[PDB]
């Protein structure tokens, strides 16, 4: 028996490749395999021990390449798409397991989308990441008498396309 | 784009300055840096004795030759600052008379295409960070399996091998390669292949997909029970005559056939329209098992056409049975 | 692509297949092909309706920041509006959205409403503020400070309501006349 | 309002074919159909997050309410972000997040908490701003005023808010509780967010259940049939199941783009609501809330958001 | 302005199979195709 | 060699139809004809002149 690892596999009817592990169902005794909500193979019994297997695909996903502009640097980092990094310096978040990139405490307003509130930008001198600003708080000083009346104005222009 | 033969960038390539033979990966390259021109030359072909065909070269000052003969090749062929590279010239094949100078060979469907670009000499301990295009000179048609090559002299050079990869080509305004880019060197690299330009502008870019592979097979199954009852029928004491064959039904129950494989006791483990080694990992409707003694010599009458005595008056057998039979 | 057929050109399929077996092999070139045609079709479409839909946007926004001023507030961009200006692009028009934005101020206290006479006052049109020592009223959207009259303001109830309506006083063009 | 929806993405082949690459291998040969369905799914995921930021990042700079909150008598505590919650969400939205395999689902780009937080600064702009923040740099007027104006914007003099202040703001502050209980007690409140959510469940489990049918094919396990079949006379039965998996996943999407369509209709709608009702005060009429209009309070939601005309 | 289109209904299966229960027999091999289209259908009406 | 009229041609090897006129191009010397940066023909070289 193999367990925790992408692995081919065949419970005595049922083929499928999976990740294993031993679950903690509680079947009713008769029954060997369990079944999600949407008709897939959710668990078998090992038919040995008579453990509860639950199977889970082998964990999987996208790759987007972190850059700056070419015009900036050649120097890259990489996101691989919500794996566990051990299953793959590196940063991990919530967003997937992005290698070649360094996360900063500092708040930073975002400029690279990501997922999770997580952007980058280059720094000095590589490739950051980190949680994404907010935006810029600014408070305001309300009272119940404190008035604010502009004084000069200027006559934007933008372009809507 | 086009995915097609070529040198990797930033290989790694042996540089030589005693010229050993050199086996031919899947692509040839070869450039030599010197003004000497001493090496001049190169060999081509399988078995490179005298025994198949092979290609030849020469590249004197005016008078360029190409050959493709059976050449007895001089095992250790050279000239001087005197060009016999072999010993004898039987069963040619083909023949063709035409500062940095680079040579990519392939035989290719059955061709042989040439490839030449030639540079000055201005550098100094190292293959130049430069970069330019491959120019074709000639294609060869010539049907010659080849897997080793060496160059023929009289300074140094480089040689590394071609490589099935993918590249962009940035063909100029004017029909010329000014510039190309590896698909699979590096990420950033990677990226200007899937977008299909040669600059990206800042953001974030989906490639590939990663996913992990099966690294193992595995199966698992409830502990083998009720094994069929087997030696009640060969480790049986005693059989019945041969007009009283006895039938014997065998139920559900899981067969093992290992046995009968692994164990010589019976004479012939002969099984009919099933291989031996395909019958122990099947399944049928049931089965049905005749246990009893005849002759020494009615051995070959247990089959199929048999016709014989036992065959007609004592136990008959379908033309089409589809099964085994043992006689010890 | 030839959708599982066996060649991709229908001329050579006609003559290095069989008629009467051409046409099963036929039918997967309509299949496919057909099928591949429709979706760009559906493509077209839902991308199309999609342009509609932006493009009475703009219908709607030309006719509204430029054939007039719309009050929206950030329909015809940021800020208060003034003007749009129509230019002509290839498949889709620009629009210059002349915008009015104020820019800087200062701090100021407020009181919102003046008792004179032991009477209540509210600005018609302004607000009252504090350069600390003399108060004033002024629009709403620009700092122009204004001296309180009775023709600057108006009246109603008195002062037993309002929560923090100041004392203070208030002009009468008629009076220094007469 | 809905705002965005469930970023799902399916890939081309591990829908199609479980990794398995004869099935891959006959797949190559519809052209390049799955790319043009990825690419779909891809721009419906990006739109999505693109949705939310065109509703709600319309204010560059953050905000925050003062300490000591003295609103000349108006409660807003029941929607101001609340301390106490670990998730320094707000009441309001606090009974709404109450009251409510060969695929992939992609997070959204912006973090619900920020969702919350530009609601958030949104409001205390719009609480002690006025509309001024939503044109430019944001100016504090005291709250009672700022009443007064849209009062003064619906042909009612400024005499009558102070007149009544304090039944004015018992009204208002008496107002916002029976919104607390009018969502704890209508089970249909949510509906249209609720509908939402269990419209694309509905989608995606149609999605997977139909990978169990067999298409004029003997069955819907490939690898069975890739065992149970020789390769050539099964690919004529995996291209009856590659046909029907494949247009079935076709209807999907079609499926998804109109409804995202919709939804964006819907989203800009908001947007635009969100603007008018919100950022100053409209008026047209019956657009935002029945009867003359004053302002708006967005609350954020799952998915999707709530206005307080 | 339009301001709603004729409520139109088609059975799954009336439509594809004008009541012969060897065709639907047939059908549903299709998985839930149809219901789902009844669905849309349903999902104009109650929209118009 | 036929100009300015829809013929079909065949320049040893390409096929196909259409009207062929002097085109300004260059290639080089080696090269045998152009192709369309979406992947058509373009342009080819006379053998005769
Ligand atoms: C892009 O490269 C050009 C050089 O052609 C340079 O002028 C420009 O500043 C660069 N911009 C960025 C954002 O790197
Ligand atoms: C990733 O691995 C760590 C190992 O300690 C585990 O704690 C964590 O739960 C894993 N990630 C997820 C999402 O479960
Ligand atoms: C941020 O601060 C926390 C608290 O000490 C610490 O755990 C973390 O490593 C810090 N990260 C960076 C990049 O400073
Ligand atoms: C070339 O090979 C040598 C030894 O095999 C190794 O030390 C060196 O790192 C290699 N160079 C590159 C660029 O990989
Ligand atoms: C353009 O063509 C001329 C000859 O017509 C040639 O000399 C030149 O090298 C070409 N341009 C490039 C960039 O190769
Ligand atoms: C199968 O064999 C294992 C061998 O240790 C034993 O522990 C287990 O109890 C057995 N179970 C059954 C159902 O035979
Ligand atoms: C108004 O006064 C407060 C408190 O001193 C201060 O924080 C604020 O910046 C002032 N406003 C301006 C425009 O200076
Ligand atoms: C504003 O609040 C302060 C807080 O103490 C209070 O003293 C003051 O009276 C209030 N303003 C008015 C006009 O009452």
């Not at chain 4, 993405?9 to 398995?20: A, F, K, N, P, Q």
């Not at chain 4, 999907?252 to 947007?271: D, F, G, K, P």
Request: net charge negative; aromatic share 10%; proline share 5%.
């Amino acid at each position: 028996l193999v367990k925790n690892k992408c692995v081919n596999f065949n419970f005595n009817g049922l083929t499928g490749t999976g990740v294993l592990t031993e679950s903690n169902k509680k079947f009713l005794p008769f029954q060997q395999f369990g079944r999600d909500i949407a008709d897939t193979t959710d668990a078998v019994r090992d038919p040995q021990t008579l453990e509860i297997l639950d199977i889970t695909p082998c964990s999987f996903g996208g790759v987007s390449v972190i850059t700056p502009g070419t015009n900036t640097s050649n120097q890259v980092a990489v996101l691989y798409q919500d794996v566990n990094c051990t299953e793959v310096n590196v940063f991990q978040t919530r967003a997937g397991c992005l290698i070649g990139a360094e996360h900063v405490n500092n708040s930073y307003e975002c400029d690279i989308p990501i997922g999770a509130g997580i952007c980058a930008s280059y720094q000095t001198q590589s490739i950051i990441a980190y949680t994404m600003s907010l935006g810029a708080e600014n408070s305001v000083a309300y009272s119940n008498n404190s008035i604010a009346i502009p004084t000069n104005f200027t006559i934007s222009v933008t372009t809507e396309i | 784009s086009t995915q097609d033969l070529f040198l990797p960038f930033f290989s790694n390539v042996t540089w030589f300055h005693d010229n050993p033979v050199l086996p031919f990966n899947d692509g040839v390259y070869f450039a030599s840096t010197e003004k000497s021109n001493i090496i001049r030359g190169w060999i081509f072909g399988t078995t490179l004795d005298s025994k198949t065909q092979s290609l030849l070269i020469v590249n004197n000052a005016t008078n360029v030759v190409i050959k493709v003969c059976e050449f007895q090749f001089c095992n250790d062929p050279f000239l001087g600052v005197e060009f016999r590279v072999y010993s004898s010239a039987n069963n040619c094949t083909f023949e063709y008379v035409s500062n940095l100078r680079e040579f990519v060979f392939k035989n290719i469907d059955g061709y042989f295409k040439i490839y030449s670009k030639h540079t000055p000499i201005n550098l100094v301990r190292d293959l130049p960070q430069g970069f330019s295009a491959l120019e074709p000179l000639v294609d060869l048609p010539i049907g010659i399996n080849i897997t080793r090559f060496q160059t023929l002299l009289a300074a140094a050079y480089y040689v590394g091998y071609l490589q099935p990869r993918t590249f962009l080509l940035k063909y100029n305004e004017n029909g010329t390669i000014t510039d190309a880019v590896d698909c699979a060197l590096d990420p950033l690299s990677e990226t200007k292949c899937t977008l299909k330009s040669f600059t990206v502008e800042k953001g974030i870019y989906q490639t590939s997909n990663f996913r992990v592979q099966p690294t193992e097979s595995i199966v698992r199954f409830p502990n083998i029970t009720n094994l069929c009852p087997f030696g009640e029928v060969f480790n049986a004491t005693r059989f019945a005559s041969v007009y009283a064959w006895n039938r014997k039904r065998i139920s559900n129950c899981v067969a093992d056939y290992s046995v009968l494989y692994n164990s010589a006791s019976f004479s012939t483990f002969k099984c009919y329209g099933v291989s031996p080694t395909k019958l122990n990992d099947l399944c049928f409707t049931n089965v049905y098992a005749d246990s009893f003694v005849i002759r020494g010599d009615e051995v070959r009458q247990i089959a199929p056409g048999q016709t014989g005595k036992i065959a007609d008056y004592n136990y008959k057998l379908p033309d089409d049975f589809t099964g085994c039979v043992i006689a010890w | 692509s030839n959708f599982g057929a066996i060649s991709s050109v229908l001329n050579d399929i006609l003559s290095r297949l069989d008629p009467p077996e051409a046409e099963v092999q036929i039918d997967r070139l309509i299949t496919g092909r057909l099928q591949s045609l429709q979706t760009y079709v559906t493509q077209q479409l839902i991308r199309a309706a999609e342009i509609r839909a932006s493009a009475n946007l703009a219908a709607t926004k030309m006719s509204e920041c430029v054939l007039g001023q719309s009050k929206r507030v950030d329909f015809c961009g940021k800020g208060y509006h003034l003007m749009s200006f129509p230019q002509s692009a290839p498949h889709g028009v620009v629009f210059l959205h002349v915008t009015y934005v104020p820019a800087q101020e200062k701090n100021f206290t407020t009181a919102p409403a003046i008792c004179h006479d032991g009477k209540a006052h509210f600005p018609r049109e302004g607000v009252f503020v504090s350069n600390g020592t003399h108060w004033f009223v002024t629009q709403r959207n620009f700092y122009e400070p204004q001296i309180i009259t009775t023709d600057n303001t108006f009246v109603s109830g008195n002062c037993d309501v309002v929560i923090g309506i100041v004392n203070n006083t208030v002009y009468d063009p008629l009076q220094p006349e007469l | 309002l809905p705002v965005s929806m469930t970023k799902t993405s399916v890939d081309c082949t591990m829908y199609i074919c479980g990794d398995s690459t004869e099935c891959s291998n006959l797949l190559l040969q519809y052209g390049s159909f799955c790319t043009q369905l990825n690419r779909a799914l891809t721009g419906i995921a990006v739109e999505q997050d693109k949705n939310t930021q065109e509703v709600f990042a319309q204010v560059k700079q953050i905000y925050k309410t003062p300490p000591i909150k003295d609103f000349g008598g108006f409660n807003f505590s029941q929607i101001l972000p609340d301390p106490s919650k670990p998730s320094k969400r707000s009441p309001i939205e606090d009974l709404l997040f109450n009251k409510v395999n060969g695929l992939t689902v992609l997070p959204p780009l912006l973090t619900d908490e920020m969702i919350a937080q530009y609601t958030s600064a949104l409001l205390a702009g719009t609480i002690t701003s006025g509309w001024t923040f939503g044109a430019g740099p944001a100016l504090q007027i005291p709250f009672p005023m700022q009443m007064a104006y849209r009062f003064n914007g619906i042909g009612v003099t400024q005499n009558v808010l102070y007149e009544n202040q304090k039944l004015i703001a018992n009204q208002f502050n008496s107002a916002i509780g029976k919104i607390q209980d009018s969502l704890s007690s209508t089970p249909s409140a949510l509906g249209k967010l609720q509908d939402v959510v269990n419209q694309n469940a509905q989608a995606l489990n149609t999605l997977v259940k139909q990978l169990s049918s067999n298409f004029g094919a003997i069955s819907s396990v490939l690898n069975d049939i890739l065992s149970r079949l020789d390769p050539p006379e099964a690919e004529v039965q995996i291209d009856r199941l590659i046909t029907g998996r494949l247009q079935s996943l076709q209807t999907y999407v079609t499926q998804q783009l109109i409804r995202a369509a919709e939804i964006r209709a819907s989203a800009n709608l908001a947007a635009t609501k969100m603007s008018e009702c919100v950022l100053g005060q409209s008026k047209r009429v019956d657009f935002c809330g029945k009867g003359y209009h004053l302002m708006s309070f967005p609350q954020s939601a799952p998915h999707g958001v709530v206005f307080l005309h």
